DNA sequence: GCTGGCACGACTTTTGCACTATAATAGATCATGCTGTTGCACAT
């Protein structure tokens, strides 16, 4: 907030916790072989 | 006859060659890109 943000908005700095989006058809895939790494690998056909 | 600016034979000055243990000091963030090390995923 405040206005170390008009600078922040114009610098196009990535936020700490970005939100991921999807594509044309996000069908259900949950996660195939969700190992100890990043789990729930979404694979919408 | 008296005087005041010009040259000459020693002396004097200039110039290239030329080689030569102790200590000011540390109190911003903030972001970005690169490098090295480690852990996750696949293969015979």
From Swiss-Prot:
Q: What does this protein do?
A: DNA-dependent RNA polymerase (RNAP) catalyzes the transcription of DNA into RNA using the four ribonucleoside triphosphates as substrates. Resistance to the antibiotics salinamide A, salinamide B, rifampicin, streptolydigin, CBR703, myxopyronin, and lipiarmycin can result from mutations in this protein.
Biotech utility:
Co-administration of salinamide and rifampicin or salinamide and myxopyronin suppresses the emergence of resistance to both antibiotics.
The membrane spanning regions, by residue number, are: none
* The name this protein goes by in its record: DNA-directed RNA polymerase subunit beta'
On modification after translation, the UniProt record reads: Acetylated on several lysine residues in the presence of glucose.
Q: Which family does it belong to?
A: Belongs to the RNA polymerase beta' chain family.
Query: How is this protein organized at the quaternary level?
Result: The RNAP catalytic core consists of 2 alpha, 1 beta, 1 beta' and 1 omega subunit. When a sigma factor is associated with the core the holoenzyme is formed, which can initiate transcription. The rRNA transcription and antitermination complex (rrnTAC) consists of RNAP, NusA, NusB, NusE (rpsJ), NusG, SubB, ribosomal protein S4, DNA and precursor rRNA; S4 is more flexible than other subunits.
